[PDB]
Amino acid sequence: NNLGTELDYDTFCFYYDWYGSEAIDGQYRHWAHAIAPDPNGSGQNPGTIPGTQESIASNFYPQLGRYSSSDPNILTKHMDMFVMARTGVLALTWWNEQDETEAKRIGLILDAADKKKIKVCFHLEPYPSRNVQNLRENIVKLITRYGNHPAFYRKDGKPLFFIYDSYLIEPSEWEKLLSPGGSITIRNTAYDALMIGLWTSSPTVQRPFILNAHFDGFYTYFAATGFTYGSTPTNWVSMQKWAKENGKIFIPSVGPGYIDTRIRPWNGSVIRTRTDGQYYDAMYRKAIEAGVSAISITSFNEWHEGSQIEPAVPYTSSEFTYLDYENREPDYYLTRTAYWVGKFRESK
């Protein structure tokens, strides 16, 4: 078929499975969230957002309400939203919780994804004492456990992982895992993978980091333009040229906006207004114009940071007046994602 409705498997949408309900999880996990103290005096008592119907840890309000990430009926709905958005890859946050509830949820997500031909890759988070040895062990575990699942993502035969805050690990350690000669290499093994590191700051720092660490590519994550060098879209043409010259895969991250002031009240300078979709349009256009081979979307459902494309509805409670999609309908960001996926494919 040539309908212009099919999923794109070079489009990765960052997905968060950390939401809970009292009924399913025993707590409204993540809808309740600590308020961060301002990093710039002592004796702050910032408190917590309680995750009641009236007061959740987002400046927006989900169409699906305070949902559980373990609810198979929510997962079905999410996969139908990925189909509407044409986003073929779900990039799943992974915190190495080592608990049965995590294992269950990952299986449910893979199963629901496969029904709609969506693929799943892992976004490896900065879990406690993360290092290249336990990363290797965990890559082995994930490939062993999930590699034969029909929804497990591969690109030209290789799994792909995004590595958040990869700068927390020195290139000399990364080399041991990712150089073909590394002491604990995954290259040429059953556990080889495309490893996509986080490009943060200026080229003088990031170019040698990426080369010396032997990453296969890099992404930028942040939905807020200008937050880092890497999340400044006017740099993307030059970042892509460097990537192509050095055999690296650049996967710029685009998002519809940013606001996290319910959980970080002091972080207002990072707010990026959605402007009825114009912000998203501008950022997505820049990624496509850079001539990249793959794009990542921040985010499907990072509700705390206001980067979500998941449908949101107007809501005013006694405790908070939420933002909403304004003149646009709740599913606008899903259908606008599909529009941009089409433009990306036309360019590929």
Ligand X SMILES: OC[C@H]1O[C@H](O[C@@H]2C=CO[C@H](CO)[C@H]2O)[C@@H](O)[C@@H](O)[C@@H]1O
Ligand Y SMILES: OC[C@H]1O[C@H](O[C@H]2[C@@H](O)[C@H](O)[C@@H](CO)O[C@@H]2O)[C@@H](O)[C@@H](O)[C@@H]1O
Q: Which residues bind ligand X (CB under 6 A)?
A: 14, 93, 123, 125, 164, 302, 304-305
Instruction: CB nearer to ligand Y: give 251 or 270.
Output: 270
CA distance 78 to 300: 9
φ, ψ for residue 113 (rounded to 5)?
-55, -45
Instruction: CB nearer to ligand X: give 185 or 206.
Output: 206
Touching ligand Y, residues 209-238 (CB under 6 A): 222, 224, 227-228
φ, ψ for residue 272 (rounded to 5)?
-125, 120
Residue 191 touches which member of ligand Y, ligand X, none, C-beta under 5-8 Å by kind: none
Touching ligand Y, residues 233-272 (CB under 6 A): 267, 270
188: left (phi over 0), alpha (psi -120 to 50) or beta: left
CA distance 294 to 291: 9
Touching ligand Y, residues 48-77 (CB under 6 A): none
CA distance 257 to 240: 23
Minimum distance from residue 294 beta carbon to ligand Y (Å) = 20
The closest of 306, 305, 299, 333 to 93, measured between CA atoms, is 299
Minimum distance from residue 2 beta carbon to ligand Y (Å) = 38
Minimum distance from residue 167 beta carbon to ligand Y (Å) = 7
Q: Which residues pair with 49 in a beta bridge?
A: 33
Minimum distance from residue 149 beta carbon to ligand X (Å) = 22
φ, ψ for residue 13 (rounded to 5)?
-115, 120
Rule CB under 6 A: say whether 305 interacts with ligand Y: yes
Instruction: CB nearer to ligand X: give 93 or 200.
Output: 93
Residue 222 touches which member of ligand Y, ligand X, none, C-beta under 5-8 Å by kind: ligand Y
- Give the distance from CA 305 to its chain's centroid: 12
Binding mask 191-210 for ligand Y (x = CB under 6 A): ---------x----------
**DSSP states along 73-104:** HHHHHHHHHHHHHTEEEEEEEE----SHHHHH
Touching ligand Y, residues 113-172 (CB under 6 A): 165
Rule CB under 6 A: say whether 16 interacts with ligand Y: no
Q: Which positions touch ligand Y (CB under 6 A)? A: 165, 200, 222, 224, 227-228, 267, 270, 305
